[PDB]
Each structure stands twice: as C-alpha cells, then as structure tokens.
Amino acid sequence: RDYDHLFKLLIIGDSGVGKSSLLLRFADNTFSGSYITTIGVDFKIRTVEINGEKVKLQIWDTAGQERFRTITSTYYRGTHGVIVVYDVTSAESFVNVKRWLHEINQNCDDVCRILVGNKNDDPERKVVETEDAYKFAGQMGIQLFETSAKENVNVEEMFNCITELVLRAKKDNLAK
Amino acid sequence: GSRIKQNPETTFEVYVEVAYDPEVQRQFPEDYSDQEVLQTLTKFCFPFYVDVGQNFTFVLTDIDSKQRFGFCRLSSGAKSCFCILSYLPWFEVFYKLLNILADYTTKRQENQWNELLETLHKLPIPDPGVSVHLSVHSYFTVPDTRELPSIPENRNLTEYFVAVDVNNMLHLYASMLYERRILIICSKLSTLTACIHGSAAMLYPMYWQHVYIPVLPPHLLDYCCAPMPYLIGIHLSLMEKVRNMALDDVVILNVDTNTLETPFDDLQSLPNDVISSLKNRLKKVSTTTGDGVARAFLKAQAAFFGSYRNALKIEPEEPITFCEEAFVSHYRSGAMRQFLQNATQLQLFKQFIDGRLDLLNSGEGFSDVFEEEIN
Ligand SMILES: Nc1nc2c(ncn2[C@@H]2O[C@H](COP(=O)(O)OP(=O)(O)O)[C@@H](O)[C@H]2O)c(=O)[nH]1
C-alpha cells in the first residue's frame, strides 16, 4: 500500500546477545514490547525512504535459538535477508553464529546476510576480538558490523547495510 | 529436543479466575506479582471474537522456547474462565483440578479452595505413579510422560482422532515432516488445541521446534504472517481476518469441515510404502484402540528415520558424530533417497540428532519406544 518494496528479515542469535535491543532501535512500532516470552516469536516494522524509494521491512525473531547448534534451511524460506548476531563478550555466541553462517552458505546461499557483534561498548569484557570476527566475515564473503545497541553506535549503519543488500538483490534479480 | 521444562520448581506458576477487556478476579498465589503474565492470561483465556466448549489449553513460550501450559475451563456462556499455568503437561490432572476449584468458587468454599491450591503449590513434584490426593477419597497418579498416549485416556489424542479424518491426519503429518507453515482452524477451543497438541505429539521422538501456538488470540493475528515454520491454532471467528491476509504457502486445516488446503504435494511425495502401512493401521479398529494410533505414527517415524543409527561415525579418541553423506546415500527406494536428503534440512530432525549425539557422547545409557521399534 504505502511503500514501494516490502522485505522480510530474520534476526538470529543466542538469547541475551541484544536482539530485542537492536530491534528497538529498528522499530517504527507504536507498541515496543516483545512477544518472545509470550508466543516465542516477535516481529517489528520499519519504513525508510532510500533514494526516493519507500521501503518497508519486517524483522522476525524467535525464542531460544541458542539451543540450535545449526539452524536449518526450512527456517529461512520466504526471507530476503538475515541479521546474524553474536555478543562480543560471549565466545559461545560467536561459535554458534559461525555454524549458522556455514549452513546458510551451503543451503541458503541466496539469502542476504550480515554478521553483527553486539555489545561492543566495554573493552575489558570483550572476548571476541575484531580481527577474528573480521577474518571469519571475509572467509564467508559477508560484512561485519560491531555495534552497541546500548549506546546506539553503528546500529543505523548496520541496518542500512542489510536493507541496501536486500534492495540490490531484488533489483539484480529483476534484471534477469 | 523436547520443549517441556524438565525440572520445574513448582507444580504450577499461577492460578487465575478471569471474568468480563477481561480482568483477573482472583489469583493464587495471592502475592503473584508478574503483571505482564497476568495481563497476557486475560487475553489467552478468551482467544476469540465475542458473538466454544469448556476446556482448552493454550501455550506460552518462554525465552529458551520451553513451554508453559495454560489449562483452561470456560464458563457456561464464556462469561468467565478458570486457568492454571504450569510447566507440567498434565492435561487430565489440571482439567480435573479446575473443575474442583470452580465448584469451590461457586459454592463460595474459600477455605477448601485455598487449602487445595496451597497444598498443590507446596507439593514437591513426585515421581510417576505416586498417589496425589485431590480429596481423602480421590486421587490421581503422577503421569508417566514417557509412555505413548492412549485412547481414550489421553484427551488430546482422543479429541484429535475423533475430530480429524485419517486423510487429514496424514496431511498434517506430511506437512510437519516438511516443516510447513500450518494453520488449524476450529470452532471449538477444546478441539482446536487438542488437534495442535495431538498432531505434534505424533512426531515423537522428534518435536516441533519452531513457532508453536495451540491457540492464537486475535490481538496477535499478525503472527500468521511469520515466514519461519509454524504450527498455529485459531478459533473459527478469526478466519475471515486470516482469509484477509491472503497467506501464501500456508497449510490450512478447517477442522469443522475437515477441509485441508495445501499448495504442496507433501503427502504424495513421501515414501508410499511407509504411508500405506500407516494409513492401513489408522483405518483398523484393532490397531487404533488403546495406544494403537500413537503406535502407528511411531512405526512410521521409525521407518522414516531409523537408518540414522548407521550414520553414527564412532571413531575412538572421541567423539561420536553424525555423518550426513552416509545418511543420505543409503536407501531402499528413490522416494527414501529424497526423503533422507530433505530430512537433513529439518530442525525437528537436527534437534533429534544433536540430542542423541549429546546423549550418546555422554555415556548416560537410555531407552525409549522409538529405539525398541527400530530393533
Ligand atoms: N552492554 C550492552 N548491553 C546490551 C546491549 N544490547 C543489549 N544489551 C543488554 O543485554 C541484555 C539482553 O538484551 P536483549 O535485547 O533483551 O537480548 P535478546 O535476548 O537477544 O533479545 C539486556 O539487559 C540488554 O540491556 C549492548 O549493546 N551493550
């Protein structure tokens, strides 16, 4: 109706990495509460105008993803792009997203994806160093964003990137 | 891979009486302070548009995707609802308890009401078979959830089997094995949530791993647009709203009319020998009495997934792994070749395997009916 493009996004990451806090920065929703602990799923909406094109994004999250050592390809059906989040202060959160990103590479290579290291706002507690995440990002051919949802640093840039990726994918595929 | 809480702290979290925006009239514990949960309960207790049945069980999912059961008892004309929220999947026990508490409430027996709830809330959770008294002359035995559900003892399976014809049971099963988005619609809430619980239970030893909402209240209708796999029940009064969403690639079962819409060829694509054998068992009286229905689906699951054992690479120096290439490259039909490859993409199969791998590499030592059925 009131937009030129609608895209469906997923955010994935262990519980506690700051996905809901990222989505709060993301959202246009009047009600900001989350239904993760109600029905085990939550969605938020953002509309943005990029070079004159009205773009609407849905982003969906689900509960307890840390129990999935691998998230399999049925999860990603119908989704245009994925925001893959770890916590820079949690080694275990990073090992999970690496498995997830290999599975996407092998079984859902058509989906746009970016890697996000959240909670990048306390050097003393940082465990996943930039170099190692950046190296992994390069190997997988994807971009890395280290963010602080808490301080609202590099969040907008991170969202702009996945938004622009899915927009480009739509245009590239429209062109044959 | 179960989403049942294995070590609940109490027999239940909170009990509420809700009446007509609906409000909590009464609660236990008296000092229960989660106003977010209380508010949520008021909406899930009346998950339909006003203008059926008595019992039904909704599920709230928590942050690690474990399940809280909202066992409900609806008043005569949907004027009020009695609900107990618990991690224990004891449908028959809590429906009974609700009846007792409702009659105490009716007869204004405040002391018996308080005593029953307090005694229950303080009770350390007992082992299966232990006697728990409702009264002096009445007791239930703690259920053994490791057993297959039996008809008519198990309310969910019994109501599911009564309401849904065999072809539609097969279509639901097939859709789950492809991890479709599945919507069940019914005018009776008891029937609605029984169909969701009962059908998901047929996946045993696997469990539905993604969105699971036995009944969805209208204020959350937009969640039918979720793109990940889901299993969602809605009351018939919400159907027009859903019809409006023009959902693409969703399996929809109208239970009232036993009409199933699916854009996929899932049931026909499954290995025909397995499905024939299942269908035939389901059609006989002799093999559908007692635990017959659950046994039939268990045998199908064993026939579909049983070869996983031969893909367990057990090379010393640790640890036991699952070899997918081995799994998908040994088959007794072209249809199974395709099935096994599809199975590697299923979250319900992934959680089953990773759970086995953990359990095996632990050295725990176990048994269940699935493994017996494989043997
Ligand atoms: N220090 C810091 N804390 C954060 C950040 N983002 C979220 N948190 C905190 O981490 C906790 C979990 O975040 P939440 O959004 O609820 O996690 P979720 O389970 O992934 O959705 C909350 O207490 C947040 O305030 C961040 O960028 N920096």
Side-chain angles (χ1 to χ4, degrees), chain A residues 2-48 50-53 55-91 93-123 126-130 132-134 136-167 169-176, chain B residues 1-8 10-16 18-20 22-35 37-50 52-75 77-78 80-106 109-114 116-121 123-129 131 133-135 137-145 147-239 241-242 244-247 249-267 269-283 285-312 316 319-337 339-361 363 365-375:
Chain A
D2 58 281
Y3 55 87
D4 300 307
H5 310 277
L6 177 66
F7 301 108
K8 305 184 187 187
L9 301 184
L10 298 167
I11 188 161
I12 61 177
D14 293 4
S15 301
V17 298
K19 291 180 297 175
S20 78
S21 304
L22 283 169
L23 256 57
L24 288 179
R25 302 288 183 199
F26 178 87
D28 287 339
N29 297 71
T30 298
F31 182 62
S32 311
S34 165
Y35 290 97
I36 282 290
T37 58
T38 299
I39 44 173
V41 53
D42 190 64
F43 81 87
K44 291 294 175 290
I45 298 302
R46 163 191 284 209
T47 301
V48 66
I50 301 172
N51 295 318
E53 290 190 314
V55 178
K56 187 175 160 147
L57 302 313
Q58 298 177 1
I59 190 168
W60 300 80
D61 195 3
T62 58
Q65 289 170 358
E66 69 275 359
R67 79 197 199 274
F68 299 146
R69 278 192 194 123
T70 301
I71 296 177
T72 69
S73 68
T74 58
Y75 190 73
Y76 301 97
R77 291 183 177 134
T79 283
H80 298 103
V82 187
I83 300 174
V84 190
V85 192
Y86 68 95
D87 169 4
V88 302
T89 73
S90 168
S93 65
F94 187 62
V95 307
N96 242 10
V97 302
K98 288 199 285 179
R99 272 188 304 255
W100 297 350
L101 280 168
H102 285 108
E103 186 82 346
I104 288 164
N105 185 76
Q106 170 194 30
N107 298 283
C108 328
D109 189 47
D110 284 331
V111 192
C112 295
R113 76 219 72 140
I114 66 175
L115 177 66
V116 181
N118 189 45
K119 307 205 183 178
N120 195 37
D121 48 48
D122 183 32
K126 181 159 188 172
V127 163
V128 184
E129 302 301 340
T130 302
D132 301 318
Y134 189 63
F136 177 76
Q139 295 185 321
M140 306 301 299
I142 65 175
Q143 307 187 46
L144 168 69
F145 288 89
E146 291 186 284
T147 65
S148 171
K150 176 184 179 183
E151 300 286 340
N152 195 21
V153 173
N154 207 28
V155 171
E156 217 61 50
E157 283 82 357
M158 178 272 290
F159 282 123
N160 287 343
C161 177
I162 185 61
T163 303
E164 287 176 25
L165 288 181
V166 70
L167 193 64
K170 184 184 184 179
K171 284 182 170 69
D172 291 343
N173 187 20
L174 245 174
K176 228 93 179 296
Chain B
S2 159
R3 292 161 75 179
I4 302 291
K5 182 120 200 166
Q6 293 305 112
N7 295 116
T10 59
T11 51
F12 66 97
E13 306 305 300
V14 69
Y15 162 88
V16 291
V18 186
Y20 272 168
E23 290 182 17
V24 174
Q25 301 298 338
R26 212 167 161 200
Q27 60 174 69
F28 187 105
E30 173 185 283
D31 68 320
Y32 184 88
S33 52
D34 198 327
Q35 302 301 316
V37 170
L38 293 170
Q39 202 61 64
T40 294
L41 292 178
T42 71
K43 300 192 180 76
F44 278 80
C45 280
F46 296 90
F48 53 98
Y49 288 125
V50 155
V52 311
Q54 181 185 84
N55 293 133
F56 68 99
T57 299
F58 61 83
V59 166
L60 304 183
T61 298
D62 60 19
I63 200 172
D64 55 345
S65 213
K66 297 299 192 161
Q67 295 166 158
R68 283 167 290 159
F69 301 87
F71 305 100
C72 295
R73 178 202 206 266
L74 260 182
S75 292
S80 71
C81 187
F82 303 80
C83 172
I84 176 150
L85 182 73
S86 172
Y87 283 105
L88 297 167
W90 300 357
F91 293 80
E92 292 78 26
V93 171
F94 285 113
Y95 285 164
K96 177 63 177 160
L97 275 158
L98 284 170
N99 279 340
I100 297 169
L101 290 170
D103 175 53
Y104 284 161
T105 300
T106 293
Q109 302 185 271
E110 303 310 36
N111 285 105
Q112 290 87 332
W113 184 82
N114 262 308
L116 176 51
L117 282 163
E118 173 74 296
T119 294
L120 183 63
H121 197 254
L123 187 72
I125 298 165
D127 291 340
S131 80
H133 277 254
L134 301 175
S135 70
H137 291 245
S138 170
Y139 70 83
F140 67 94
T141 60
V142 177
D144 189 340
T145 51
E147 298 169 4
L148 287 169
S150 183
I151 298 178
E153 289 84 10
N154 187 268
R155 295 275 292 272
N156 283 331
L157 181 58
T158 304
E159 185 141 21
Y160 176 45
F161 190 62
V162 167
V164 177
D165 65 40
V166 169
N167 198 45
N168 290 325
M169 288 184 76
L170 297 183
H171 275 284
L172 278 182
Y173 176 56
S175 305
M176 296 181 193
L177 291 180
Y178 278 84
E179 275 180 346
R180 301 308 186 187
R181 306 178 198 95
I182 301 166
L183 190 54
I184 300 185
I185 311 182
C186 190
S187 61
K188 197 171 194 284
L189 295 178
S190 67
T191 306
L192 179 64
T193 65
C195 286
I196 294 278
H197 292 298
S199 68
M202 298 301 94
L203 300 175
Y204 182 87
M206 294 152 218
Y207 304 89
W208 190 255
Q209 295 299 341
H210 288 315
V211 176
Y212 182 79
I213 308 177
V215 58
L216 184 72
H219 77 284
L220 298 173
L221 257 168
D222 286 342
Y223 280 83
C224 294
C225 295
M228 51 218 50
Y230 67 63
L231 181 54
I232 297 187
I234 59 167
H235 182 263
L236 187 63
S237 60
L238 279 65
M239 187 167 61
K241 281 275 171 57
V242 162
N244 265 27
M245 288 169 173
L247 298 173
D249 278 35
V250 170
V251 178
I252 306 177
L253 173 64
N254 187 320
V255 171
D256 290 31
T257 63
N258 260 281
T259 308
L260 186 131
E261 310 138 35
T262 176
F264 310 106
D265 63 333
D266 299 333
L267 178 51
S269 292
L270 293 179
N272 269 73
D273 46 335
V274 180
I275 290 301
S276 287
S277 191
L278 172 53
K279 189 179 195 179
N280 291 343
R281 280 185 181 110
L282 291 179
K283 282 183 178 305
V285 177
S286 60
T287 65
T288 49
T289 55
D291 68 355
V293 169
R295 294 285 295 175
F297 279 94
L298 182 75
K299 288 179 181 290
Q301 287 294 83
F304 279 144
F305 295 98
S307 75
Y308 89 93
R309 290 231 202 115
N310 320 127
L312 296 171
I320 301 169
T321 39
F322 185 80
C323 180
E324 275 201 5
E325 228 194 61
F327 187 63
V328 302
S329 61
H330 189 239
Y331 45 80
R332 294 221 168 264
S333 66
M336 276 294 298
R337 176 185 188 189
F339 180 91
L340 297 158
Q341 176 53 52
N342 298 339
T344 68
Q345 307 302 295
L346 302 174
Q347 203 69 56
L348 60 92
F349 184 57
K350 184 66 59 165
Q351 299 310 110
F352 169 75
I353 291 301
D354 284 345
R356 284 290 200 259
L357 287 181
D358 289 359
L359 177 62
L360 290 177
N361 278 316
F366 66 96
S367 98
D368 60 65
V369 283
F370 180 70
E371 301 299 344
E372 298 163 24
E373 198 61 55
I374 289 184
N375 297 342

